[PDB]
């Protein structure tokens, strides 16, 4: 009615304002830099022990221990240097699609189709891992949960909302709303001040943790976004979706910067991660292998093959020493 | 070589043995995915089992002839179906419940859901057990009102047997992969153990076919 026209005019003004800042393009600026050589990565370790599809994984802050969640109701903590199973937590609900590692390493988190985020305490006087908390209140399946400061955690669910909890009390400190479709992933900023959430409506939103307010909204994808990852600088990010294209946006310019796509790729992207310096971009696809793109030249720098099924989880250590990939054939692989 | 890393390796090996034992124990269970359209008779089928915090998924454990059955109810997910259906790729069978007495073309919606589920790229080689619930109400309705209101394309009388058979075949012919997977159809009866016996027979046949495919034959 009288406000839909106003909203359309505001959208047109936004488009015109963000168009005027696109004086140049990143590709035409960076085509005068030396291309990175053919990136060959070798499999150093293979972590076996899962008896079902591996749905998520996360590195520790020390970049030696990692946590992996499988659909057979198991959380496993691996010491990657020696491939030793430090801990094996049995989950109450076998339907888990996410996992997280606390920055201090004291807790782990899991979640899935039961709409409950379970927080397990690792350092106990009893010598065993016990479920410290069971946060409930989401009306949809948990899709991604990220620890913030070892006492508050940000979660996203299929009810088109995100939440910021308080672990001691188990209550939603803040609720972020504004997405239309199911939120499929989130990624905190390096300083843990803002974060970005990608939804199934082909849209990403930049939320500010304080005040529960949305700063900016980015569009451009043609299908649901399945993964997201901040640039190490903290002023940009990259999103992968089902249309087999990665998109790199920047926060300050508030518009798209680059698109990474290939004619031979038609399968969607399940995971996206950057490198320590931000030059490389790791992206796992459904064609059973991952791709290493040049984030500044939009050309394929390498291919990581060796998984017999769809690559579901992917992570890079804090020091950038190795890349851990996990697929649906119940195997994790470390690449260096 | 190792000073107390040997003890860590021993702990890892014990954890490995425990994981193998747990996997072997969990591999002796029958996992059935329960589906329906608008909770049409799902509760009645569930109540036939013999033996509150979470509202996302529902677990049902029971045992028949010492064989252990697990049923998952996902009727309260309310999200996109394609976002979590791939989690159930390894279920033994899909128990699909359809209310016979069915108006806002509810039967058409049930048929659409059945077609979407049966032809899914994840549920190939997965058998479907069809449960046509509420036969007495269907009998009363067809005696009162002709089935032609829902099905103007019908060229038959108003007897119960032929209409039920027609519904059965029009549900069974929606399966495009007639060779890869079979559909077991049953009419829900008030008898206590007949439904469980039918489910057990279908599961036994599915297990036999799976072993035939796995043991080198076929």
């Amino acid at each position: 009615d009288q406000l839909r026209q106003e909203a359309e005019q505001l959208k047109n003004q936004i488009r015109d304002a963000r168009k005027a800042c696109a004086d140049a393009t990143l590709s035409q600026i960076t085509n005068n830099i030396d291309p990175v050589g053919r990136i060959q990565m070798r499999t150093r370790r293979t972590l076996r022990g899962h008896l079902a599809k591996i749905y998520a994984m996360h590195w520790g802050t020390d970049s030696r221990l990692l946590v992996s969640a499988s659909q057979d109701g198991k959380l496993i903590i691996w010491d990657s240097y020696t491939t030793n199973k430090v801990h094996a937590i049995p989950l109450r609900s076998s339907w888990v699609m996410t996992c997280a590692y606390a920055p201090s390493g004291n807790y782990v988190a899991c979640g899935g189709l039961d709409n409950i985020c379970s927080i397990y305490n690792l350092k106990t006087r009893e010598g065993n891992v016990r479920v410290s908390r069971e946060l409930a209140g989401h009306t949809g399946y948990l899709s991604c949960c990220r620890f913030l400061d070892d006492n508050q955690i940000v979660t996203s669910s299929g009810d088109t909302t995100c939440a910021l909890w308080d672990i001691e009390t188990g209550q939603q400190t803040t609720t972020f709303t504004g997405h239309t479709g199911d939120v499929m992933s989130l990624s905190l900023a390096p300083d843990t001040r803002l974060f970005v959430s990608g939804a199934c409506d082909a849209s990403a939103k930049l939320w500010d943790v304080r005040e529960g307010m949305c700063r900016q909204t980015f569009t451009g994808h043609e299908s649901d976004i399945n993964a997201i990852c901040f640039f190490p600088n903290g002023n940009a990010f990259a999103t992968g979706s089902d249309d087999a294209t990665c998109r790199l946006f920047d926060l300050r310019a508030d518009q798209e910067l680059m698109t990474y796509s290939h004619d031979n790729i038609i399968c969607g992207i399940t995971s996206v991660s950057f490198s320590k310096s931000g030059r490389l971009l790791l992206a796992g696809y459904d064609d059973f292998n991952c791709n290493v793109w040049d984030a500044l030249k939009a050309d394929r720098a390498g291919v990581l093959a060796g998984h017999d099924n769809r690559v579901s989880c992917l992570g890079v250590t804090d020091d950038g020493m190795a890349v851990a990939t996990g697929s649906w054939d119940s195997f994790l692989k470390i690449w260096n | 070589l190792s000073a107390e890393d040997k003890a860590a390796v021993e702990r890892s090996k014990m954890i490995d043995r425990n994981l193998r034992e747990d996997g072997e124990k969990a591999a002796r269970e029958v996992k059935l995915l329960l589906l329906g359209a608008g909770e049409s008779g799902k509760s009645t089928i569930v109540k036939q089992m013999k033996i509150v915090k979470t509202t996302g998924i529902v677990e049902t454990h029971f045992t028949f002839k010492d064989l252990h059955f697990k049923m998952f109810d996902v009727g309260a997910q309310r999200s996109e179906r394609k976002k979590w259906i791939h989690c159930f790729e390894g279920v033994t069978a899909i128990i699909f419940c359809v209310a016979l007495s069915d108006e806002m073309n509810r039967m058409h919606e049930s048929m659409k859901l059945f077609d979407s589920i049966c032809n899914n790229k994840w549920f190939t080689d997965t058998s479907i057990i069809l449960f046509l619930n509420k036969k007495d109400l269907f009998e009363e309705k067809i005696k009162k009102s002709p089935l032609t209101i829902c099905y103007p394309e019908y060229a038959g009388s108003n007897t119960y047997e032929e209409a039920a058979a027609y519904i059965q075949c029009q549900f069974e012919d929606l399966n495009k992969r007639k060779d890869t997977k079979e559909i077991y159809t049953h009419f829900t009866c008030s008898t206590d153990t007949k439904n469980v016996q039918f489910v057990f027979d279908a599961v036994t046949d599915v297990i036999i076919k799976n072993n035939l495919k796995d043991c080198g034959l076929f």
């Epitope: 010491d79 009893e126 | 107390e4 040997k6 860590a8 702990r11």
Partner: single-chain antibody
Framework: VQLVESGGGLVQPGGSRKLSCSAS????????MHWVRQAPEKGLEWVAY????????YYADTVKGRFTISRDDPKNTLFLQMTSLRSEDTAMYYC??????????????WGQGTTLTVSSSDIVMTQATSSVPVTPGESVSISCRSS???????????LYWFLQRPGQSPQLLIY???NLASGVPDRFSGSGSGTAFTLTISRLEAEDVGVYYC?????????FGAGTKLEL
Amino acid sequence: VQLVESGGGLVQPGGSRKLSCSASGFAFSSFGMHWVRQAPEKGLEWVAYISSGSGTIYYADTVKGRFTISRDDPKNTLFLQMTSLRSEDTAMYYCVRSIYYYGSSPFDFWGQGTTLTVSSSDIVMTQATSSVPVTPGESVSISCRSSKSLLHSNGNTYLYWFLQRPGQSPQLLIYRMSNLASGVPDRFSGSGSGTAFTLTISRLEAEDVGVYYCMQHLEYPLTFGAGTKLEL
């Protein structure tokens, strides 16, 4: 969490006895168990060790052949059966728990000990000083020395600092020469290199007096070495 031992008392030479160690308040099946012995007015001395699941069993050289260590998991208990008891076995026995994984702290909790009286080792750790007169207002340094390089090829130095208060059982102060144990005041600190190690106390209190021991965990003989006494 508590370990309660029983079976002590007076035994004639050449006899036999069985000590029991009952555990309550923790997952017994996941912890390896050590039997340690302290002679009257002498230092600690390792005796026996049984792993989790009874995988590997280790004995001290001086007690090999006549002692037998076993565990019962359903009843949460640990047995030490001694046969052919001699005159140097009269001591007080401690039941210690230790769990081994990446980042764990073995030897964290010690039992209460039982007194048994009898009527009628390639690595040697030396603590040169025996007693240190100390006032409760300054900083103390306790030095330990080893005959072998305790540093391993993986970068982990295996030295443990324990404190035994007068009339109580020892508690783990520091594990792996640098990491502070849980529930230990920050005034304690540890450092060292390869063969020479130091424990520093910034400011003592009435609870900082006692005997300090430095144990090794590189080769399994697990020698202890006499401790350093801090009083007054």
